């Protein structure tokens, strides 16, 4: 090493090395490339911790603020508004589970709520509830010596996840998440007073953002997640041995100004000796709905749906009678998953800084605050969907709520599949962008990238839908271009 001198060493070996060792640039044209292949299988079930578009609320008018009053007292206030409870009957079974336990849990809960006299409710450890919360279902830990010779002693099932097909429902869920509602779901805490002109400008723009985001349906889901996961984490820690009841509550204000407390159902926490950040808490969710589960039975694989009542619903000029279902299921979460659920309000930040950068990007060019024009005019609009008529464009407000829904759904349906899919497909998008910028892109192993992407599309409804969304985007890009040596790079 001390006496080494260069004398064409690399050059020599480059001659010596096989010419199979190379990096051939294959030119990349997105007209050439195929759609991502989505997996076949049984359909993907709903896997959220709470009902999304299928939820139903019992509510009360209530001057209380965005998280005020004792939960179970508020919960009973919401139950007393509704009469016409029926004898409960199973209308859709949980095929893999003992369904009369689910039925007995509901009847036990309802009765224990009626007989509660306190701030909190801990249920008695009955057999039906013990089964529903996995009491005693951990195999007993032994030394290896004592069990070495057992025949069926194997290592734990460590296969890849079972594939599942893209179902209609997840696209439907996302559409509803992007909608406006008649209620302000998010109350924001105070700032210091505005002094700088830029702080006044900010507040003016923040007024627009705040309404758009607070009234969006995705924000309702944010508030359910922040409530549920906070309640579960706190009770998981403090009441480790108790089967504690947590009512699913949110608070909101109308467009009309009236403050309101909503009740969606109940959650029964199992035991919660949570040591590792992945350690599981078993719970049972019992959630109201008007959705008939038989119309889309693949959505509800994990649920046992009861028919628990009848509701007289008021409309334009006709009272309608609809049956009231109760979607029951066993479910689970962890300290880490609860932590991130408690933090779901950051989804607001993801959407809004993308939107504000768009407003700011034009403001730079136009040399004026384009906040007011963007929200109030309809001259500026971005593609955000497909109807049979074609590619539908939305305003900045719509874009904001779609981006908020995306971020919320990334939080509700977080997975290694999504992580992998998002990271690898970003490369393919950037190649498509490079081509559309007239920058002559090139791949080395395009088949390998497709495999990296497609490997991650296994069984998750959200990742499945994002894969579909990429193909729809790919197809839309191909059409605006078409054949030719000088294709229309510009959209419309």
């Amino acid at each position: 090493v001390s006496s080494f001198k260069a004398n064409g060493n690399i050059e020599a070996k480059l001659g010596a090395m096989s010419e199979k060792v190379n990096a051939q640039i294959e030119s990349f044209d997105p007209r050439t490339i195929r759609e991502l292949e989505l997996p076949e299988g049984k359909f993907c079930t709903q896997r959220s911790k709470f009902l999304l578009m299928d939820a139903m609320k019992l509510s009360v008018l209530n001057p209380a603020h965005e998280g005020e009053g004792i939960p179970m007292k508020d919960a009973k206030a919401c139950l007393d508004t509704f009469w016409g409870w029926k004898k409960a009957t199973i209308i859709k079974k949980h095929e893999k589970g003992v369904n009369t336990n689910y039925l007995m849990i509901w009847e036990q809960l309802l009765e224990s709520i009626k007989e509660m006299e306190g701030k909190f409710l801990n249920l008695k450890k009955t057999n039906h509830l013990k089964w529903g919360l996995g009491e005693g279902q951990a195999p007993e830990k032994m030394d290896f010596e004592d069990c070495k010779e057992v025949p069926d002693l194997f290592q734990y099932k460590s296969e890849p996840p079972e594939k599942r097909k893209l179902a209609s429902w997840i696209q439907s869920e996302f559409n509803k998440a992007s909608e406006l509602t008649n209620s302000n779901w998010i109350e924001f805490d105070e700032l210091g007073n505005d002094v700088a002109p830029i702080e006044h400008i900010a507040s003016r723009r923040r007024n627009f953002f705040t309404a758009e985001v607070s009234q969006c349906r995705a924000s309702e889901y944010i508030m359910k997640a922040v409530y549920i996961n906070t309640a579960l984490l706190n009770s998981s820690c403090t009441a480790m041995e108790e089967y504690q009841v947590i009512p699913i509550i949110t608070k909101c204000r109308d467009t009309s100004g009236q403050r309101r407390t909503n009740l969606y159902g109940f959650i029964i926490k199992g035991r919660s000796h949570l040591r590792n950040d992945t350690d599981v808490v078993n719970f049972i969710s019992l959630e109201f709905s008007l959705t008939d589960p038989r119309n889309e039975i693949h959505k509800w694989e994990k649920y046992c749906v009861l028919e628990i009542g009848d509701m007289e619903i008021r409309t334009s000029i006709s009272t309608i009678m609809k049956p009231v279902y109760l979607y029951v299921r066993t479910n689970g979460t962890s300290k880490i998953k609860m932590k991130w659920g408690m933090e779901m309000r950051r989804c607001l930040l993801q959407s809004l800084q993308q939107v504000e950068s768009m407003i700011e990007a034009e403001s730079a060019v136009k040399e004026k605050d384009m906040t007011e024009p963007f929200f109030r005019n309809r001259e500026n609009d971005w593609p955000i969907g497909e109807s049979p008529q074609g590619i539908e464009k939305g305003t900045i407000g719509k874009v904001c709520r779609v981006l908020l829904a995306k971020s919320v759904f990334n939080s509700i349906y977080a997975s290694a599949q999504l992580e992998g899919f998002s990271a690898e497909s970003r490369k393919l998008l950037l190649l498509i962008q490079a081509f559309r910028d007239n920058l002559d892109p090139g791949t080395f192993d395009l088949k390998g990238l497709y495999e990296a992407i497609e490997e991650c599309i296994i069984n998750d409804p959200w990742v499945l839908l994002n894969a579909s969304w990429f193909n729809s985007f790919l197809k839309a890009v191909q059409l605006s271009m078409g054949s030719g040596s000088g294709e229309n790079l510009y959209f419309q």
């Binding site: 909608e179 406006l180 007024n207 627009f208 309404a211 758009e212 009234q215 467009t255 929200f375 407000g397 719509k398």
Partner: peptide
């Protein structure tokens, strides 16, 4: 500001 949508 009250947001609206075609819906």
């Amino acid at each position: 500001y009250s947001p609206t949508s075609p819906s």
